[model samples]
Target: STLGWSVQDWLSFHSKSTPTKSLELLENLLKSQKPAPEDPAWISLIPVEDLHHQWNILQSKSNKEELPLYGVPIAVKDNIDYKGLPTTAACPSYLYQPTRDSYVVELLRDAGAVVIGKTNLDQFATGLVGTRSPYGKTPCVFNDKYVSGGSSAGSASVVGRGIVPLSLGTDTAGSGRVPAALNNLIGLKPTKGAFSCRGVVPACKSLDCVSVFALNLSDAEIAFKVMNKPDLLEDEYSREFPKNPISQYPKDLTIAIPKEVPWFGETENPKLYTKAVASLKNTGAKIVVVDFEPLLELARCLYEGAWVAERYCATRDFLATNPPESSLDETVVNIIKGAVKFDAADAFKFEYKRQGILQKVNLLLKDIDVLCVPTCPLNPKLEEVAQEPVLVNSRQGTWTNFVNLADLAALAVPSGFRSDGLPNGITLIGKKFSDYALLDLAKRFFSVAFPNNSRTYGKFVDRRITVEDELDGPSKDTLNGVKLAVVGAHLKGLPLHWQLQKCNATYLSSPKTSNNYKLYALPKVGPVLKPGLRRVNDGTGSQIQLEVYSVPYDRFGDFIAMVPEPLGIGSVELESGEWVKSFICEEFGYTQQGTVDITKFGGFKPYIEHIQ
Candidate 1:
């Protein structure tokens, strides 16, 4: 059962997705757990007694210093196996009992992880949209209207929602990543077959990997160290995990970006992407924009080429004999059926095509340490997907879907929210066995992009002493400056927030404008509000809440010029009748705007959560 948490509660509870904290929280929540309906968010949960037994095992192992996961409860994607559990793969027809744990599960258990029951997935692990399941679709965390990226939908969802710190997902295409990006979590796709595939269901088995999903980089890294293993007798694809001696640490880094990226008819993604690139630039790294023709060609090959035959090979026997129910999504079934069109000759032709693409990809990517791109080019609503399933699924995998086929590793890192109040993310693609190095770069990139936030959601539980605390009472810095009220992106942590920080500006508390104004959230504004403050004698409307800050006179002019129209720098009065410079929209644009009146909301930051 889920106890609904406000965003702030989630930020505090999962500040660090460590095992010690996760076990304590889970044990507590589960002891008094209630039943929730079989929604898309979950497939099945382990009985509370089973969870207690597993927790005790972890505690015993930890006392002996033999713990790796250290009591962490991890959710297994339904396609994989846990001892005494069923493997459904989102299809009732394919259900079977596994007498022994899959190699991946055994490795995690050896590391002291407890199983948290099985999770749902796309039927036969075929689509990126999370909706293709008997279980309802998993929606994006902030907006239920949008699809939660899939076929590892459950794995990503459980981790992102902070239900469990770690979950296993198989990525044949974008299954592992698209969900991670949509839900603001970390998805680690290891070099193909790094984790043994023994005793597990397969989707493109040769290219498949048992991947990890976690809330932050540190937890994901720890879980990777614990779960990766070599199974000599069980699976041929399993190889010894490589340990490269560090010869030299990186002195410089280069990130390759696509010169021309398709935005899938959404401009907000492009704007957020540009900001992501700019963030890398701030890290003192060489940002290179190269033609993505080779990468794009290879990405297309994952679905259009003979690789679809691999999916058929995994489930063809059961599917051909039993025939999927008519209620099953036809688009997924059709894609599965198309694999039969290829024969031996076609397979060889695809192999030849794959070799050619690999050569071209390596040549194009030679000089770069890693290529960075938005994990998904378009983030669509669940309604839009219900309207066009096939097209939407393809669009969501624009930058994903190709890594496993190319035999490479990828890491998805959160870049924060887009203009539409939806999460934005980027993936770092690296050569085989360069997973560790890629994660190091992601850590640095995350620091530079979001320097202020110490926690995953930008609010830290701990507080520190600032310069204000060092000085005596009411010093010269106490309050001498032009009082500025900033709404829209100019508020702290918003896109324009940096301009104030760079100018050595200090933030006061969030405030509200005195009546006669409209708050218009402009399109493509990057998760911020753009208000139009109007004056009226009759005062029927209420004051809109906003953040009032103070900036020195030297930086005021430059800040005003950048305030592109329908917006302006103006004065606003608080309820106390005190006046300060604030954001105001032109009166003429009032009719064209959607105003959120927040007279009751004491400040701007409080209302921010309301929007989500």
Candidate 2:
């Protein structure tokens, strides 16, 4: 179920090994592991017999490899309904059996993914701290003493421990991303309403998003592609957005970060945040720091303003039956009950203020392509959280609360480890429907931050995967580079080889020109011995050897500008029928008295060898 298998890796294994065997292995693996009784990672797991039955049913429908999520095991937060499973939302008294699956769960099953279990979450998905659960507190995967991050706590912990590669969680105010940050997982909190919310228990119905937690960006992306569609239920919140193509981030990506971050007095948190910002430079991103005041002000509205009324309404019926004094966690009860203080006029006032803040944020983000910030300002110890639950939990959402409030897509990724061995994470934020673009940028940032483990593909992929196979949008690698064919002086160990190095060009391959070209050694022009390539109409020419180099798009023009007379960049056909920018000579220059027809030698080095 886990094993750090990306979708591509799992598919490769399924094609060679049968799906039944894969399921058996996963089942056996899960059976052999055990966590403490107080552990809050899961509320319920599908029985082994039930899982087996589903596997057989899946096989009957289609070949295991026919679907994208074939045989992929996934888990969902209990707030999401799954057929025949009771969803408790971490409150035992509120349990109810859902007759049908959620829109996301149904989609996952249709794609051949097996739902293994439902995970625990903050009660009613109300808090940013995982400790609010009545079931038990979900601890950080790396350090048990620290909080796991919440609302989506268990979803992230399961994936973090490699128990399952993907899980579904709900995000109202950073529930998905904060958990991911604490657990070193990728949490894709998509744009609001991008994934249908039908059958989900609402925390803040207007802002809730079904988020995905996965071992890596590719797995998260696979889950997103499968579940991101308008549901048949005619969900009121669901709206269609144009399909965004996946491509590599621009070579010069611009990112905005907070000018000053409040780390909640954690001495090392700010230092780690600074390091993460510095590491992004390796991805070729130009980082800008701006006043995050407007965003923070907007964020406070989700909890401090009338939106608390939304959370209150979601659980008001259940709370009415249970005595608030005894049945519910005090923090959860207090927060929900606090909404009663706001009247209708307060709601209208906040709406007006929200609109004003949105305008300020849009202007702040006008020049940047993306935004980066700490996933959680502070990582509190479990003991510390138990003592100061509400205050610590609220402060953790410093960077996260504004996201759904302002209508943005975000990807939370592992940045690096703190000095204490706990993991630190950063979130990449972008405009609506820019989910794929943000993942591309995260991938680039991940590669640069961890160069030794920089392979973007899964373990089963022996060859490197390009953007077409790994990312969502485009079918080609998006970063701009130019292919230049070198005939003579620019080849390795040649006289003008320094020019290629000066431009930081990478040697791609040694290819041959089509048999319809001629090669000539032009007379030394100011001590430069160069070759001229000419296309001929007559059917009498030899395939001339040439080397191809990929030059950075920014440096390509400078490389071309250095060319002397009679030679310019032009299209030349390769022996493989591919065309690339190459050096071409004017007919008059090659027909001069001192020029020698070197076509018979096939290449410049060979002609020099023959003369010597």
- Using lDDT as the measure, which candidate wins? 2
Best model number under TM-score = 2
**Residues 153-233 of candidate 2: C-alpha lDDT, one tens digit per residue:** 889888777677789999989999999878777889988888999999988888899999886676777788777787635
Clashing pairs in 2: 245-473, 246-472, 246-473, 246-474
- Displacement of residue 124 (Cα, Å) in model 1 is 1.2
In model 1, the Cα lDDT at residue 137 comes to 82
The C-alpha TM-scores of every prediction are: 0.70, 0.76
lDDT of 1 by residue, 1-612 (tens): 333222223334444565566666777755542222345766667776777677666556535234546455678898898874678788776778888899888888877677876887888888888889876687776677887788998787767666666789888778888888788777888777677889778878788888888766656666666655678788878876443311111435678898888886887777777888898888888888898887778888887888888888887788767655753667777898899899889988888888898898888777887889888887878888889989999988888877877778888877777757777688888877777667777766776776654435311113211211111111123334577877666776666776675554556787666675545444434444654555566456577667766666766776776777777777777767888777767766555645555445544555666877
Model 1's alpha-carbon lDDT is: 0.71
